[PDB]
Amino acid sequence: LPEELNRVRLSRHKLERWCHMPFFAKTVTGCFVRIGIGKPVYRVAEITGVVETAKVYQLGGTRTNKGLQLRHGNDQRVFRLEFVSNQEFTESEFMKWKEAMFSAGMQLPTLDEINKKELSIKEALNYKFNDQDIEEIVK
Amino acid sequence: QQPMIYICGECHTENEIKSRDPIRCRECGYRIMYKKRTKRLVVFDAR
């Protein structure tokens, strides 16, 4: 179902809050983003690792030069944080991702994994920043 | 679900401070920072 898949769908307005929050390779790795290819076609790519680009680009007010290790089944490449869509997972793109995963040999992540993964985001949001994260954030 | 937003001194950037937080700006580092105007009804008599 592309509806349950949208709960772990990472929109564009949520990355801006966590451009400098650590544990980043532990909350976002396992969710799905709506990245752009381009003309209005989209593919569901997999947040695999946390990479950094040597291109610093501004996203509205904020700027971030990092990358995202995304992959659509087998086609994997680098990605920046501006081409992601706030659009939810549609039906044609959900089935397209399903066919890219059935076509690649990757197992579809079980729904219980998505249910245990979607709560990591809400706990990371209400997280009290009592430790030394403000300091590294300003740096 | 309102996080008590402050305005920095030297930055002029809105920060979100909830309780039990250090008062510091999310950037540049500033210990002084001010509060935003109210949302209530301000009505004056031009008098």
Binding site: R12, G36, G38, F83, N86, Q87, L125 | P3
Partner: peptide, 17 residues
């Protein structure tokens, strides 16, 4: 105040660059 998109802010494409 979680995702106030209301669509969006003209999402830039990857094959546009």
């Amino acid at each position: 105040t979680s995702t106030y998109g209301r669509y969006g802010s003209q999402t830039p494409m990857y094959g546009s660059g």
